[PDB]
Amino acid sequence: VSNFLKDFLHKDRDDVNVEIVFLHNISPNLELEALFKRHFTQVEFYQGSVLNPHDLARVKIESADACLILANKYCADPDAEDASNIMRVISIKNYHPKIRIITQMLQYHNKAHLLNIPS
């Protein structure tokens, strides 16, 4: 989150009025809460999985500009983490297919699996 937020809120980038709404089922620790309290006016957090359409309507993903998915690079199974990202893009496209998903994969064949989704 820190490496993402510095690149997203950097002075060199044009001023951004866009807010950032996180969504993660694990409740954050005190240091992540302190990071949110730092970038208070620009970021909000909301606990929940992405595999719940009630959670997606709660974070207003249909009214959201673009969804982003950050993959765990350092994982013990580069296919299982790939699979979790697959299921996340599946759930977001199942709720609202008219949204822009910016995600990150771990191989090249998984790009075809992403292409399998109709939207």
């Binding site: 299982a80 697959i86 299921m87 699996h113 989704i117």
Partner: protein, 167 residues
């Protein structure tokens, strides 16, 4: 005798007695062919493309050596039931890993109209080879469904194969 009724309640059903004003198997019920060969039923993509299959049945399987044996004999039995004719009997092709197909072929040999395509059910080229478009019904089965312990893997393959076929 007794009458099998399909009404919406028990009390509605409780009105009938109240208101009164070789070519087959060794048994007969199925079809049996001689034990064929795994090399006879393995096809390649070009051979399956030249094999014209219209209205047929394709079965997708996500099986491996670590996966449990599903058991497909119960699946393929009422396809070869003798309530139709041999010309009416559909053709079946199995798409998946040849390891799981070898693990199950020792059960799967006494049945006609059965092919095997080793490969991957996610392969769009393999689906175009087996003509899923003309295929009457694609059946997507999963074998690793009771060894994986996560919704992320739970039916993940089945969902991908369905979405690829729809796309």
């Amino acid at each position: 005798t007794l009458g099998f009724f399909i009404a919406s309640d028990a009390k509605e059903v409780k009105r009938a007695f109240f208101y009164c004003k070789k070519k087959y198997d060794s048994t007969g019920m199925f079809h049996w062919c001689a034990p064929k060969e795994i090399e006879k039923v393995i096809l390649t993509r070009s051979e399956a493309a030249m094999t014209v299959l219209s209205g047929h049945v394709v079965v997708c399987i996500f099986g491996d050596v670590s996966s449990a044996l599903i058991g497909l004999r119960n699946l393929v039995m009422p396809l070869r039931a003798s309530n139709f004719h041999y010309h009416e009997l559909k053709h079946i092709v199995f798409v998946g890993s040849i390891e799981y197909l070898k693990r199950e072929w020792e059960t799967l040999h006494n049945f006609p109209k059965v092919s095997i395509l080793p490969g991957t059910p996610l392969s769009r080229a393999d689906l175009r080879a087996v003509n899923i478009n003309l295929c009457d019904m694609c059946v997507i089965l999963s074998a690793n469904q009771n060894n994986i312990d996560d919704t992320s893997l739970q039916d993940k393959e089945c969902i991908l194969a369905s979405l690829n076929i729809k796309s």
